Design a protein around this ligand. Sequence first.
Ligand SMILES: [Mg+2]
Ligand SMILES: [Zn+2]
Lengths: 66, 288, 54, 251, 1316
Amino acid sequence: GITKASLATESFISAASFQETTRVLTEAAVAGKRDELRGLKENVIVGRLIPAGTGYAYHQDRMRRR
Amino acid sequence: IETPITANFREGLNVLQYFISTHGARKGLADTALKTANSGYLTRRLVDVAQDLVVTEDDCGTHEGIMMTPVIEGGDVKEPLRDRVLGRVTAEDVLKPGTADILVPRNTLLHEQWCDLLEENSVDAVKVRSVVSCDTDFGVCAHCYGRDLARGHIINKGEAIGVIAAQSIGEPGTQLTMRSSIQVKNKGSIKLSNVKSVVNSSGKLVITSRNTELKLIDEFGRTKESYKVPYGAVLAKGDGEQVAGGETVANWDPHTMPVITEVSGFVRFTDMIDGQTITRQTDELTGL
Amino acid sequence: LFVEFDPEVIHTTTINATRGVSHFVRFGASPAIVPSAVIHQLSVYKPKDIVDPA
Amino acid sequence: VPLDGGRFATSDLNDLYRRVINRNNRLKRLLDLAAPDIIVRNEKRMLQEAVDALLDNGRRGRAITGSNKRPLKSLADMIKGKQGRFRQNLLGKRVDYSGRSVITVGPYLRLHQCGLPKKMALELFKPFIYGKLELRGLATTIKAAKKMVEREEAVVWDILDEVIREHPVLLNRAPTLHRLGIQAFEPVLIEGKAIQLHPLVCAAYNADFDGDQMAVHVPLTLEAQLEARALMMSTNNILSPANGEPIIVPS
Amino acid sequence: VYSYTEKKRIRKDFGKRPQVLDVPYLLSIQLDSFQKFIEQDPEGQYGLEAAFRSVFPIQSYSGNSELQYVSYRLGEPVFDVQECQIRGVTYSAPLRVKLRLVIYEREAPEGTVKDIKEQEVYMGEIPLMTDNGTFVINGTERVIVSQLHRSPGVFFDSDKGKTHSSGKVLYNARIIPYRGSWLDFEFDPKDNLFVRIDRRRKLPATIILRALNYTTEQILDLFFEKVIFEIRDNKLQMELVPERLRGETASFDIEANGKVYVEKGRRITARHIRQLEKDDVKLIEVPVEYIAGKVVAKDYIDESTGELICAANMELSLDLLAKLSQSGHKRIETLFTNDLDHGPYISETLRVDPTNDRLSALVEIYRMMRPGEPPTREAAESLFENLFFSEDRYDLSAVGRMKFNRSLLREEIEGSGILSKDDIIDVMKKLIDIRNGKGEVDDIDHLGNRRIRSVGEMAENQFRVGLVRVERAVKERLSLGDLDTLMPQDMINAKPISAAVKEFFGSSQLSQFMDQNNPLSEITHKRRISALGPGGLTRERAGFEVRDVHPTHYGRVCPIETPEGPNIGLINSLSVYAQTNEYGFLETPYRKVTDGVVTDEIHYLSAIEEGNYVIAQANSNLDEEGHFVEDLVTCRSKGESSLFSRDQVDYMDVSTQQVVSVGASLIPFLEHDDANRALMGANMQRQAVPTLRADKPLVGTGMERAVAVDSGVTAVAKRGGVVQYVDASRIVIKVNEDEMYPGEAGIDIYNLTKYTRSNQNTCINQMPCVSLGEPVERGDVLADGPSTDLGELALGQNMRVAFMPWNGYNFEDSILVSERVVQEDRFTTIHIQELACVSRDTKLGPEEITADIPNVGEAALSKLDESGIVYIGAEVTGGDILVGKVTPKDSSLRVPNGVSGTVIDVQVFTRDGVEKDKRALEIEEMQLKQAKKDLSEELQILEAGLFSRIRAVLVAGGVEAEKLDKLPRDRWLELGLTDEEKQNQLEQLAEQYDELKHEFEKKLEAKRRKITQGDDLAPGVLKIVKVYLAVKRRIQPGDKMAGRHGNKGVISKINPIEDMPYDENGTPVDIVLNPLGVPSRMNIGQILETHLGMAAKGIGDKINAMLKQQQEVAKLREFIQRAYDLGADVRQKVDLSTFSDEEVMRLAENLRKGMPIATPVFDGAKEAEIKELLKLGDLPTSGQIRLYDGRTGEQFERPVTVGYMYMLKLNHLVDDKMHARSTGSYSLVTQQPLGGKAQFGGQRFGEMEVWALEAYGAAYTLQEMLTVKSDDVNGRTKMYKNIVDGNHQMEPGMPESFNVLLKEIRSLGINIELED
DNA sequence: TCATGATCATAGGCGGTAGCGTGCGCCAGACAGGG
DNA sequence: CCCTGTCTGGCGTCCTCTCACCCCTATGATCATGA
Ligand SMILES: [Mg+2]
Ligand SMILES: [Zn+2]
């Protein structure tokens, strides 16, 4: 289901900006989980370009230079 | 209320009729309040489960898509083929029933001219490429999505479709609500699906299956009526036959589950010991 | 603080209106029977200092 | 925070940290001067319960309060839920160069333009006017330009008509439901104090004119003007993204 | 006959039903409840005496001392209401209490105290209520709102369906005390019976039945019948009553008297029961399998062994029968445990019980209350006697005892406030009866189960909580001190009492700030039945059913006036005729319809007495005697409407206005509006604003005079008489002699309230509406208030409206208004803003208010005087200086940027000790001079009335016609006159005169003391300067106007005069609405209001034509009489033949701007009457005039509807919502802009807008929308330099609030970082 | 000159010799009761 | 150990506007007045 499918992600910032933050941060704390900003909402959090519109061309350039 | 409001707003309404109108009106207002309260949270959960899905390639390179047929509740056809297979890339290339003659190639966006050419030849089921059966790792390719809705051409490489999808589903959530036989209408050939039938003594065709689905194939190929047929129902017709309109072709009992047979012979009791397995209950006021 | 009294017949809420009451030494739900180590085997002390704390 | 009354109604965090430091200093002093055998235990229980009040108040049994019934705020109450850093400060922010007023009709508009007051257009577009003043040479420094546009002299309205001209703004209705709820127009200066908004466009906002209020935002940078012209303009979004029905249906 | 202000402008009245009970005083809930609260009340209850006699005498901890109670008394307040609102104090009265201390001796508490002491003591300050029904808490006029909550008593609810997911319903029986511990009996799906106390842990219910000292034999004696088995020579025979066998299938062949009655395999029919009870069959024969599962009742013991044969409540087996049979017992008592009739719920409950006697039950109850501690028998007895059985901790009220006896079918409605054994046993009996299938459950929303608290009862409860805290202090101090040396004011202290009552009146969830911008808004905020608050439900949790109108709101709570939004149906408003019962329920009037005739006696019915009887509907036709003219009449029996016969009715409604409230009974043609639009119309009629010159409603309901007079905005005459001096400030009435006291000679002075600030920044004015020399009657208006006119209620103004689409400028709901409206200054409302400036006390020294100010020149300081404060009258702009203030740094008060105004009033308050500057001494001399002149004029005016009394007495009995005015006037007593009533009366007037002399001396000294003294103020403030700006806001495109039916709208274009559609007479229409709002939003009442308003103005135009031509009074009398008859059988029936040729000219002077027409709510003017009144004027019959165009000058096809609609300006203006921000201040903890308008803030770019920009491809717009424009401080300073240099470019950086997220997550044990 | 009384200023977390709480509701997943 | 009930954790629209409220009580010390 969509609330369990959104809480079960490989990215703890999305699952923290959604429902319960305590359980998500403790599970990602003891697991040592490592987000890589992976899409839209983590980049809205951290203050950079969305990888959707014009920022999609910017992210293809940034990933090609990796 | 069994005594209705026999007065309109051009004339007056006396006190009780206006009070009953107030029952209805305040029920509606409280529905709208708590309705908005649920609708906003539905939009939130949908844009937070989608959230990430970006059109990130241009061709996945698979074939398996879903099968689009017009929906048939059992009356008029509610949603036709033109309004479902409008602008979505075909899975297997559609061959007209002049078999080994291709009508559309297998990567053609079906815009309005192609949909009219589908409606003319009365195409059965245009198997079409869906987002759920894609192959792109970490995203969704462009051809399996379809037309860019709100525009005309194919979807651009990049437009975040999870967010527009979740808003398009949750946005009419404000408008939503919160709190015997088979009668035919049209005329055509008769189709049966998933049936185990046998011949009775009367000459009809009786059924030994719950999973029977009756269909009305029309003159050009598609289906305009579908009926779930119960277990042990009795048909006045058979498969592949021809009927007329207004003709009830099936009848059963919704109260009784019939245990009808296949072979013709005597009836005996096996592992039926009286007093324990079967009891003696005489029907008092009837006799049988 | 060490106080001698008897629990059941004299119920506490009656005596509550006074000081001497934060609550029993517990280490658990029940009011724990405390030892009197100073009274029994440690009478006279404070040779730590009279530091007059800070 | 001061409340301008000689006293500081403190935040809940300083109260919590003050309780932990009181209890910890008393426990250091009680471990200093020796604990009475089975005694150095109640104080550690109190310290554990004060830290459990600080890290997540209310998760352990009955929460604490300062005044009077409401439980006060720990750290986990600053990260979680609404009124916390994820949903109130990081995903949706308060934004400079913005304003809001009450909408109205004005049917003499083309559908890519909206009426917007002279006072709102003068207060949103201030640094543009400062730049045009010290680029045309009508004020030496920034302070003379600020006092000119505070006095509203007779030349700054020409400056304002020369900065509005090809510069979109974003209009926004307050319950944004779908993506047509934010659109971009080219302003027209209006004597008055309301936002004149094209009528056909109000099919997409679900907006009547019985007291609705809309908010305008300004795209500062150059790429944002191009995105509010090529992607978000009111002439481009004539089809809904839910179907193929037009959204410019005459009402 | 008519009162003299009803001969000014007599309102035309349609309406058919002759009234029998007039509208009561609309503020009787507030005033009657608080009069019930504070009054010297003997016989104990109710009031403050209930608290002072239930918490006192405080007796000590066995120290033989006792602080008992005598009486109480409230002194006068030190400040009257006007000084209290000006200065800012509470409007309180000191509560003196006479307490007594007695101290008993040793060995005899039944012996003599050695010493008593009775004395006066000070405790608390309770705030009084003003005559308007409001409180003044800190200078702001507040209202405490009535609460609707659950009635104390038993309540048998049924948890239907949802539990256990198998359809098996539960049944719980909540006993709701008024004060104490709750008690919930319930079931479970195993059909056991479970008690619980205050929602705590669950126990089996019979554990409390042992706690009331019942043995188990007595419990089964109570809760079951008995079945008798007699061992008489054959198979252990049975006593059988066949009523238990109604439908049971026997296991054998029941025969008796040598006759087969019942066969095996069949059931016992009812006729077989008749056979067995007709033959009187007693003993039948049972097999050995019949008592295989019968449950024994009581204990049987064997006499030989002394052991127990079988325990109580145990099924019987073969060996138990073999044991008790050979022990000598012939009688066996068992129980009847049927499937349908009587389940063994008590028996299964006793089988789950581990307890066995009283002590173990009390131990288990003491253990479920306080967990994990050693119980003792004394502690368990004390706890269980202090849960339910003590006068202290448990108290049903009289309401509670009434519901508890009524819902258990008792007789006496009087009992003790505590429970007993019979009470709990009757609760369990009724719960088992409801489970058995007979009897019904009780719904919640039924208004026989919803009590109404008010101001008096809630203030009593908060005062009682203050008293139990202070008895928790007095019990501490009384037995821990030396006696006798102290007095009972050293013990009891006034801090918790005053803190409790001041916290309740100060900040509660029901003591709320009065919405005061309208007389209607006052009088409908005071009448509010809120469901929220303490003891009720909450908005964001519940629910569905409580937000719905129950069938018994008819005539108690209004169905259509409620706020839409998050709390619909919780903020209910009480109806018009709805009183409050003795206990607290709602009651409404009816007319006792005896067998044929509707008797005109009123008769108040409650909510449960209404259900049993049958009530006729309000508008049923009856022919002059009371005989119902139909033979089927629409009535309602038990919450359900139907059609009944002519003379089975028992009550009729009083008047047809009683379902609605006073908010929604000023709507004309209410029966034509759909209920949603009537709701929105009533709510916006509450939200109006007072205009400059309020006019009148042409189409009213006649309910305007009740709302105007029965509120407190007009100056109602107390004693009638003759006016002597009218002024814009004061009004002097000379009291008539047939209404007048013998002493205290008496001519009344009404000091009107001129321009002052309301709570919603409107302008609460009072204008005198009487002439000079004019007679006034008792109970009559003298001075109109805000939004009143001649004693009526004029909220908005009535304007010429046309329904036509006009070139798109009224597209959705918009309104288009001619410039003729704004030229006439007719919506030009007047607002008043209060701007405060305090002189605080900081370091480097105090502040300066003087005008020697740095950084300023002549152009600022020209509008200040020589001491900083702006003048009275200086018309300022937005951003000048009002008060100049410099700190040890300019911090002068300024007009906030945007508002103009004219400074009308300046107050200066000085903390005592501080040097008064020259303007504070100017205000002190000014107010000294004003109060000096005012009290001297009090003495002069009352002395003039006294000398007029002396002249009136000396007309007879030793009259001196010439000698009276030769001597000075102060000696009119020693003239020639014997010892009569006249020299006695002159001596009494000399007593009054010398009293006025010495009273004037002492009161002028006290008033100089009040002006000269300082005022107690904030900690560390020198002086407070308050300045009142008086803005005059006219009208503009963007304001919100609305009619009285829900037709809202933002006014969209203020056209010129010429563009308006005019007709073939010449007059332009004022407002052009939109027709398309009528068929969807079904408010068809506004079109009937429009047509009847055009009829009213047609009659007004014909009066103006017959009067402008200077015609004699005969033709005016003719036409006014024809316009006042005009209808069916109506109520008005006026005649102008008793107005005498001078009032008719003045009545026509008041009718020439239109003729007011009353239209009551559900008995209004029909269509044919509107047509006949439009035929009296020469207007067209259909109401539609053909209208030309203003632009083209050519005719609109298909003639359009014009008329007059009464439209209201709402105070959602557009220069209070409009806001704009380039770059302002920034918040401190997260570097984002501030929120709001007063704080110069920016609009919240919320979360759904972020989603809507992700939904496009706009990426740079969102990046600057949440990094550059909002948060990043170096990013936004780079942005500001780049914008003022022409380079549109952003240097992004990081949001600083994300660094705040890192510090808050990092301040835990969590280690968040940023890699690479 | 000394003592007593009154007034003013400064200083902390149910208030009491108990009991207050009581009108949301669903889902879900772990913890444990019964068999 | 295999259900099956209980328990306690989560969650419950957006934007804006207005208003009030944000310790008082007790103890100790100092000063003044009276004996
Ligand atoms: Mg609207
Ligand atoms: Zn694909």
